Structure 1
Amino acid sequence: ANPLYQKHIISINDLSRDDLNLVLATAAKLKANPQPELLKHKVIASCFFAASTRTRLSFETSMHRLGASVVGFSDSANTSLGKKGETLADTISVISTYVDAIVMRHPQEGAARLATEFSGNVPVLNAGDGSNQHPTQTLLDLFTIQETQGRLDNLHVAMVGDLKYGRTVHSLTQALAKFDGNRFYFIAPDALAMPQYILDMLDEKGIAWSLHSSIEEVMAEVDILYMTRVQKERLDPSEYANVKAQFVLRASDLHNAKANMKVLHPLPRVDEIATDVDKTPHAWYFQQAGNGIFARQALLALVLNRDLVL
C-alpha cells in the first residue's frame, strides 16, 4: 500500500518530505518508462470552476498518458452547480458517485478541502483553491529543481516578484524548508514582499534567508532563479512602473550567473522575463512545464494504484 494510495492532495503542508521524495521518484521513473495502460478503466473528473491553461491541459494529458478517461468542465462561471445555486458540497456529492478521482480548481480558498468531506471515498486533488494552495504546481517545481541540480538540499534559491501574493512562491518556500541547508534570497518590492509568517517559520526552522533589492544583486550566488509574475492592476500604473525596472529579467543580467543556474517561472510570463532569456541555457521555464506532465502523472498513479512494479 503506497503511502498515498487513496489519499487526497489538498495542501503542500499535508505532504511529508518523504511523500515529496516519493512522488518525485515515481515521477522520474514514469518519465523513463511510460505506463500508458496503468489507469485504464479509471474515469477521472476534471472540474475546473476557474480558468486554467497548464493545469487543466497538463492534468488531462497526464490522464490520457496513463490510459485514464476524462470527464469534467471549465469556466463554471455560473451554470448549474456551484456559482449558480447549487452548493459545491452537493456538486461533489454527485460527481463522486460518477468517477474514481476528482481534480478541481476553484476560486474560493479551501474548496478542495471541503470536497474531501463530500467525495466519500473518492480522492480529490487540488489544482488551485483560490489564493491558498497549489501542490501539483509545487511538485512540478521541486522535480524540475532536482532534475536540474541533483539536490533539493543545500541550495541557493532566489525568488522574485510578488512574494506577497504569489501562492506558488510561498508553497515552494514551504516545501524547500523540509530539506536542509537551503538558503533564500527574497528579491521583491517592499509593497510586495514575503509575508512575515513565512519569514518566521524559516527562523523557527533555523533557515537562512536574506533580502535583496535586485536580481543582479545576488545573481552570482544562486543555483535556482524563481520569477513570480508581478501584477500591475494590483499596483498604480505609475507605481507599477516605478520599481518595475529592477524586477525584470534580461539576458544581460545573466552573465555573472553560475552555469548550474536555471530560471524557472510558473507561467504565464508577461514581461518580467525578456525574450532574449528565452535563448539562454538558464532558461528552463518551458521544460519545467513539460515536467508538469510527469509530476502530475506520478501523483495520479500513486493515489489510484496500490503500488507499481517501475
Structure 2
Amino acid sequence: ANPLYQKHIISINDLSRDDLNLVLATAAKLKANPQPELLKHKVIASCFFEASTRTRLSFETSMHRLGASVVGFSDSANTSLGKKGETLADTISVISTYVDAIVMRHPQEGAARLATEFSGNVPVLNAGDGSNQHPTQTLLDLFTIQETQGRLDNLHVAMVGDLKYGRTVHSLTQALAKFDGNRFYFIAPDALAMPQYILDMLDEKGIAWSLHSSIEEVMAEVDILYMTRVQKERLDPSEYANVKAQFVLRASDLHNAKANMKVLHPLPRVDEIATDVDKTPHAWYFQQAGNGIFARQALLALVLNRDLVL
C-alpha cells in the first residue's frame, strides 16, 4: 500500500520529508483531478471535543468531496461520551467500533496520541490537541508554500505575531526544517518570541534565523510572510496597544515586496492584516484556507485507500 495507508496522523514530528512530499503531491493530483467516489462507503467520525468551526467545516467538506459519510459532534459543553465522567479511552473504544477513521480536536495535549491506543485498526487524524500539534494546518501551509513558490527548500520565510504560543508556527518551522537551505526571520514582541527550543533545533541543523523588530527590515527579501493572531487575552490591554504596530500589516508595507511574495495567516486575521491587503497579489490567506480541502483530502485518501490510483 502507499506509505501512509492505515497510519495515524498525530504529529508533524512523526512525518518524514518524504511523507510530507507524498501528501502534497497527492493534494495537487486531487486538486487537478477530483475523485468524488474514492471513499464511497467509508464512514468518518468528525469528533470536535473542542469546537472549531473553520477546521471542522474544512475537514468535513474534504470527507464529502471523496464521497465518504460523516458522523460526529462539537462544542463538548459536556458531551457525556467525551468529557463528563467517561474516559477519552472509553469514548474512543466505542467510536472505533462504528467508523473507518477518526478526526479529532481536543483541548488537552496528547489526546490524539491517546486515542490511537484505544482505536484498534481505526486510524486517527489529529485536528488539534491543545498547544501541541495541528498537523493538517501545517500540511495545508506547506502545500500553499510549495504551490506558490515552486518548492520547499531555499526559501526566505518570515513568521510574525505570537511565535511563543502559536502551535501552528512551531510546527511549520519544524516542517520547513526537514527541508534544505531555508532561512527564517522572526518578528515578534519580546513577550512572545519564538521559543528557545525551536531555536536550538535550528542551530543543531545548522539552519539560519534572525530576530527583527518589524516587517520592513525584512520585507524585501521574503518569499513568505506568515502572520499569526496575537491573542489579545494574553497581554495587558496597554501592553497590546504599545506593541501591536510592529505586528500588523497594511498594503503600504508591501511597496517593497518581491513579486513572488505571498502573505499567509492561519486565520482569523482581523487585528493583524488590514483589509486593504486583500486586493494585493500578495494576499493569499483565503487561497491558503481553500488549500486545506486539498491537503485534508490527500490525507484521508492516503490513509483510507490502499494504493493511490492517482
Work out whether the TM-score is over 0.5.
Answer: yes
1:53-74 Cα deviation digits (max 9, x unpaired): 2210011000000000000001
Structure 2: distance between partners of 1:227 and 1:201: 21
Residue 143 of structure 1 is matched in structure 2 by 143
What secondary structure sits across from 2:296 in the alignment? helix
TM-superposed CA distance for 1:231, in Å, is 1.1
Which is further off, 74-83 or 220-229?
74-83
- 1:82 Cα shift? 2.2
| Distance in 1 (alpha carbons) for counterparts of 2:29 and 2:102 | 24
Q: CA deviation at 1:12?
A: 0.4
SS of equivalent residue, structure 1 residue 113: helix
* Deviations 1:223-254, CA, capped at 9 Å, x for gaps: 00000110111000000011111111000000
Structure 2 unmatched runs, 5+: none
1:279 match: secondary structure: coil
> Residues of 1 paired with 2:204 and 2:291: CA distance?
32
Shift of 1:177: 0.2
What is the Cα deviation at residue 270 of structure 1? 2.2
Deviations along 1:174-230, one digit per CA (max 9) or x if unpaired, are 000000000000000000000000000100000000000001110001000000110
How far apart, in 1, do the equivalents of 2:177 and 2:193 lie?
18
- Quote the offset at 1:309 in angstroms: 1.6
TM score, norm. by length of structure 1: 0.99
Following the alignment from structure 1 to structure 2, what is the Cα–Cα distance between the partners of residues 112 and 270? 30
Separation in structure 2 between the aligned mates of residue 113 and residue 309 of structure 1, nearest angstrom: 29
Query: How many Å apart are 1:114 and its aligned residue?
Result: 0.1
Query: How far apart, in 1, do the equivalents of 2:214 and 2:51 lie?
Result: 32
SS in 2 for 1:171: helix
SS at match of 2:91: helix
The offset of 1:83, in angstroms, is 1.7
Query: Equivalents in 2 of 1:114, 1:129: separation in Å?
Result: 11
For 2:275, what is the secondary structure of its paired residue?
coil
User: 70-79 vs 134-143, which deviates more?
Assistant: 70-79
Which ranges in structure 1 are unaligned for 5 or more consecutive residues?
none
In structure 1, distance between residues paired with 2:186 and 2:74: 35
Task: Write the deviation string for residues 104-127 of structure 1: whole angstroms up to 9, x where unpaired.
Answer: 000000100000000011000000
Q: How far apart in 2 are the matches of 1:306 and 1:200? A: 38
**Farther off after superposition, 78-87 or 201-210:** 78-87
User: Quick one: percent identity of the two aligned structures?
Assistant: 100
Aligned to 1:285: 285
The count of aligned residue pairs is 310
The alpha carbon displacement at 1:276 in A equals: 0.2
- In 2, the alpha carbon distance for the partners of 1:130 and 1:207 equals 28
Q: Tell me the secondary structure at the aligned position of residue 113 of structure 2.
A: helix
Partners of 1:300 and 1:68 lie apart in 2 by 10
Do structure 1's residue 173 and structure 2's residue 169 form an aligned pair?
Answer: no
1:100 is displaced (CA, Å) by: 0.3
Q: How far apart, in 2, do the equivalents of 1:231 and 1:76 lie?
A: 22
Distance (whole Å) between structure 2 residues aligned to residue 241 and residue 250 of structure 1: 17
Cα distance in 1 for partners of 2:247, 2:59 equals 31
Any idea what SS the aligned residue of 2:6 has? Answer: coil
Deviation at 1:76, TM superposition (A): 1.2
Aligned-residue CA RMSD (Å): 0.6
Alignment-derived partner of residue 101 in structure 1: 101
Which position in structure 1 is the counterpart of 2:199? 199
TM-score by length of 2: 0.99
Counting only pairs closer than 5 Å after superposition, residues 1-310 of structure 1 correspond to structure 2 as 1-310=1-310
Secondary structure of 1:225's partner?
Answer: strand
Which consecutive aligned stretches of 4+ in structure 1 deviate over 2 angstroms post-superposition? none
Shift of 1:141: 0.2
